[PDB]
Each structure stands twice: as C-alpha cells, then as structure tokens.
C-alpha cells in the first residue's frame, strides 16, 4: 500500500481553524494545477463522501457522489484524474474502450476442472468503497452505460446464469471525463446539444461541471507564469544538469 | 562450360531482345506489351544503398487489370513455371500457401512451427497474386509493409522477429464494375488504394473491344 502523536496535531489544527479547514484543504488540493476552485471542492467532497443509511425495511439509500467534467482540451482534467488516482486508496482507471461491460462487471465462467460455475469479479466489483476514473467517457458504448447505471443507482450488481445467481456489492464512486461532440465547446449552442447525452444518464450523475478555455490576457499571463515556474523547478539535493 | 559460350554467341545476335520478348508465353496470343513488361520484370535491375542510410530497391513489380476472359491467369501460371523460385497465391481464400506469418502446430508433422507468409518464402524470388481485389485487411497490411519496408515484423506467442522479404510482386485484378470505363481514371476503376498502386512500377490495362479479325484469329488458335 498510522502514526501515534499526530492526534494532538489534528486536534489543535481543527480546534484552531474550524471554518477555514475546508477552504484550506480545497486550496491545497493540487498546487501543480492553477484555478478551478469549485472542481477542487467537489473532489474534496468525493474524498470525504456522504453517509450510507440503512433502515428497518431493508431499503438502501446511496451515499456516494458522481461528478462529470466537460470542457475544451488542455484544461487539466486528466491531470486531476491522475492526482485522484494517486491519492485515493482504492482508485481504478478504466478508459472508454479499454474495458467493456464484461470487464467492468463480474462474469461467470464454467470451471473445466470440476464442472462448476464460478464468478470472476469485474473492475467495479474490486473497487468497493473506492474511486473509478473513466477518461474519454463519451467514447463508451451505450450498453456499458446501461450496465454502469445499476452501480450508479444502488451500488449492486445482479448476476444469474442457470445453476448460479448472486448479488455483489459495488458501493463505489465515479469520476468521468468527456469531450464535447464538436471537439470544442460552442458558446452559442445550448448545453444540451453540446453534451449530447440522455437525460437519465445526466440525472444519475450528481454534479456537472463545464470548463472553458477563455483567452483572456490576464488569465493567460497568470497561467504562463505558473506553468513556467513549475517547469523551472528542480528538486533540492539533486545536482544541476543531472539526468534521470 | 559450352553453355556460357553459347549464351555469349546468342547475345551477339542483333535481334536477341525481340527473340526474348517473343519467347515468353508461346501459348498466349497477342499482348506483346505485357510480355515485354514481364521480361523486364523477370530480368530485374540492381539495388543501391549509399552507405547505410538510403536504400533503393531494384525489383520491378507488375500489376495487370483486365476484363474477364483476357487470360490473366495464364501469364501467372507461365511465370510460375519459368521462374526457379516462384510462389503462387490467390486472395479469394483457401490458398495452399498463406500470406500472413503465424505460429501453429502443423497438422501433418504435429510439431510447433513458425510458418511465414508467401512473401518471406519468395525471398530473392517471385510472388504471384491472383484475385488481388478480394483480399482482406491483414493481407493488404502485410503486402503494404512488404512492398514499402521490404521486411515483415512478427510479434506473436513471445516471439519477436524481423524477416527479409526481398521479392518481385506480380498481381492480377479486375475492374470494380466488371468492365473497364475509359472515362474514369485507373484509380477509380480499382478497389485498391492509391498508396498500394503507387508501389507498382508497371500497370497494364486489358480491354475486350470487339475486333472481328482478332476474335477470328483467337478462335482459330
């Protein structure tokens, strides 16, 4: 893949900052990425998560959140996905056409050694109480989306092939990154035409974010400053001009 | 020993080239230009390589496109008979020799073998292709890489190899609509793509115009 005396540090920091805790945590999420405060806050909310509730009648209420980011190219979405993958304990990246419905969802295979039928877990089954990142979400086929719908709704997978039937837990959270149908986000057209997704899929998502590459001179100056400051940086203790 | 002297004496003849051109395909009537082009392809040229940077091949690839009934397959059969190392294959399917390399247990010998395509087996030889427009994606890609890079790369079952495929390709084909249309270009009349056509040095077009005297002579033959 815990310390002993950091509990005092945690207690002191909490009792001191209180209200500023969330703002400071959101601000320091990723220094390498400039701007996008609301996206960082949403990512922090995903990291924290909600509360799962179970009642007497056995009804289940989902406690996970889902966020979909749409925008122009080169707005640091894949970088955020990679950072979440690095930081999250159980994080799994699954691109659009990299894995099909049989890979994302557990399947049944008949064992030749004994003649029985066994279950092989899918990508989402393994990531229980974790994070699944899906880059190029638009390229995904409809059937995979229908399969993912059950997990996004109740976080469970129902499988049945004659002689065996089971229900597996899939209590996970999803990050999705997709590109507009026209390649670049058209300002004039309505968001419905640009996104090009059915209402049910969007409704099952919790948050939708739209990011734009506005060519404002001050924003460009600040972004260039940050990028070149990061590029000029060298780790201390390493001799200048050393290779890797 | 005496054969060399006989060859030198024959070369001294003033009409040796015409004799060689007329010698090819005795059983095929007409098509003098096709025979001349096939002779030029058979004799070949000379590859060059200044240093180890710029490689220029010396093989003359030949493509024939024609209407049905023009005896395109007879030329390929005659070339296969004449050539010392000639491999004949068809793009329709069920060919004796495949066009793509693969690793398999041989049905007869029951041994684990790596069988290369016809291009590799025809190294320093001749490869004849019939039904050039019926090929699938794998054959087209293999032919493209064998004609451009003159080599075949294999990465299968833990085996990574590169094999030389220096060969001369002679192909036969038919038009898209079943009959050549002079109003359209050669590229528009063939299902092949422009990069594939660009590789062939000689392109021959055969038509079936109704000439009573030629038809009478062909029927007599």
């Amino acid at each position: 893949s815990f310390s002993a005396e950091d509990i005092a540090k945690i207690k002191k920091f909490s009792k001191t900052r209180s209200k500023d805790i969330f703002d400071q945590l959101a601000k320091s999420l990723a220094p390498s990425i400039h701007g996008h405060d609301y996206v960082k806050k949403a990512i922090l909310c995903l990291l924290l998560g909600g509360v799962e509730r179970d009642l007497e009648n056995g009804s289940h209420i989902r406690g996970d959140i889902n966020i979909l980011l749409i925008g122009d190219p080169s707005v640091a979405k894949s970088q955020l996905l990679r950072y979440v993958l690095c930081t999250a304990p159980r994080a799994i990246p699954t691109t659009g056409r990299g894995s099909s419905g049989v890979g994302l969802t557990a399947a049944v295979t008949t064992d030749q050694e004994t003649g029985e039928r066994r279950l092989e877990a899918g990508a989402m089954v393994l990531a229980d109480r974790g994070v699944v990142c899906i880059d190029e979400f638009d390229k995904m086929s409809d059937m995979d989306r229908t399969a993912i719908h059950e997990v996004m709704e109740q976080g469970r997978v129902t499988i049945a092939k004659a002689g065996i039937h089971a229900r597996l837990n899939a209590r996970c959270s999803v990050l999705a990154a997709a590109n507009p149908v026209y390649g670049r986000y058209d300002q004039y057209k309505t968001p419905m035409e640009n996104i090009g997704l059915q209402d049910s899929l969007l409704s099952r998502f919790d948050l939708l974010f739209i990011m734009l590459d506005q060519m404002d001179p001050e924003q460009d100056r600040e972004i260039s400053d940050h990028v070149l400051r990061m590029h000029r940086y060298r780790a201390p203790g390493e001799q200048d001009g050393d290779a890797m | 020993d005496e054969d060399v002297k006989m060859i030198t004496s024959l070369s001294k003849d003033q009409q040796i080239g015409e004799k060689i051109f007329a010698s090819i395909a005795p059983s095929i009537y007409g098509h003098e230009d096709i025979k001349r082009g096939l002779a030029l392809a058979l004799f070949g040229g000379e590859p060059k390589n200044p240093g180890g940077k710029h490689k220029v091949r010396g093989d003359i690839n030949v493509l024939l496109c024609g209407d049905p009934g023009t005896a395109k397959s007879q030329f390929l059969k005659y070339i296969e008979k004449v050539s010392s190392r000639a491999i004949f294959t068809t793009g329709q399917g069920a060919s004796a020799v495949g066009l793509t390399a693969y690793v398999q247990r041989h049905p007869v010998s029951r041994e684990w073998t790596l069988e290369a395509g016809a291009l590799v087996l025809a190294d320093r030889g001749v490869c004849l292709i019939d039904e050039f427009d019926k090929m699938n994606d794998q054959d087209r890609t293999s032919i493209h890489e064998a004609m451009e890079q003159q080599s075949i790369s294999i990465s299968k079952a833990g085996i990574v190899t590169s094999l030389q495929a220096r060969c001369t390709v002679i192909a036969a084909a038919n038009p898209i609509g079943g009959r050549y249309d002079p109003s359209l270009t050669f590229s528009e009349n063939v299902d092949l793509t422009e990069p594939i056509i660009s590789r062939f040095d000689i392109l021959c077009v055969v038509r079936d115009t109704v000439d009573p005297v030629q038809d009478e002579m062909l029927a007599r033959f």
Binding site: G241, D242 | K48, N49
Partner: protein
Amino acid sequence: VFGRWDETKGEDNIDFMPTILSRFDMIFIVKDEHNEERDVMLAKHVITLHVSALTQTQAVEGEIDLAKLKKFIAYCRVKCGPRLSAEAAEKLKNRYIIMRSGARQHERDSDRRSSIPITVRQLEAIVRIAEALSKMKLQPFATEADVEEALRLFQVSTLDAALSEDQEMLSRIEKQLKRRFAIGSQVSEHSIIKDFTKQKYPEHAIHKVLQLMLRRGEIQHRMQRKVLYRLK
C-alpha cells in the same frame, strides 16, 4: 483528404479532429512547388546519386558516420538534461501571450474556427524544444539563442500551418472569377489576363487559380487552348 493539397480551400484539407491535432508539437505542410529550374536540379541530383552510389560512400563535408552519430546521440541522452532560465522564461511568456492574442484576433476576424488551436501544450512544446536544443550542447542551462531558434521553428511550422496574404489574395481572385463567369459563356484567356493585370494582381496567382479550376473541372478548353468555358 482529396489526395492532393488545395491551396485556395485552406482548411477542411485535414480530416483529423482538433483534439488529436492539439497533441502534436509541430505540424509541417509540404507542397509540390513547380518551378522549371528546380526540377532540373532534382533530376540531376538523383542521377548523380544513382551514379555515385556504386563507387564511393564518403561524407560530403564533415558528416558524422551513422554508428558514430548513434553512439553520440545515446551518450548525450544518457549523460545530462538541461532546464530553462528566468530571462528566457520571461521572453517566452511575452511571445506566447502575443501569439495567443494574435491567434484569437485572427479567429475572430476570419469568422471560422481554426483546426489548429494554440494552447498551453504549445508553450510546453516550445519549452521542450528549447530544452532539447540545450541538451544538444550538453549545457546544464538553456540560453536565449536556443529559445529564439525554437520560437522560429515553431512559428515556421505551426503558424504557417494554421494561418494557411498570398492565399487570401488567391481567394479574392477566385471570388472575382466566380462572380464574373457565367454558365455556358466563353472567355478568352487574354481577356482574363488583361482584366486582372489592370487590377494589378500578379499573373502567377491567376495562372495558379486557373490550374486549380482546371483540376476541379469547372473550366474546359473549347478551341485549342485560347478560349475557355465554364462547366460544373
């Protein structure tokens, strides 16, 4: 897309989406520049290469051998890797801001989305090219000259590809010719030449437009090569 480049059409000659085009650091466009004096040089050069390939394989002027060049490249890649400096960073910042502003202005004026956008990825590409130039000399830090050379290369490739006054003038000639011509009418080449020289446009542009129209098939020859007529 069409098999051969169409200068007047400008964009739509590239089938790739802007997303995949943004990844490439540099894009080069090559065209068959037909010059009578240039073809003779190429033919003579090819024949000379073919002749001299048999006899001698020697470096022209101090050229490095293939094995030596390979080993030198490997040694340079393994040994060291350079990084930028502050002054070069500031210069690149200013140049990138100016280039982005100019690209935005060009897109607004042309009233058409450019198929080759400019983003932070281009800035990182320029940084990478400057770093490669510095690495070529094994220097630990890059200089302003390397940044200038990288900017020149990036301009010549990317800005020429994206902005593709000569072409706009050719478009003006095309629009004027389309407006003046009519379906089924005949025009003498001398009349067109005189009309466009009275407007003080270069003759080479007119000839290129006529050749492109002939390639498209709109213009056909009626009586020898003197009089043209318009088709569709």
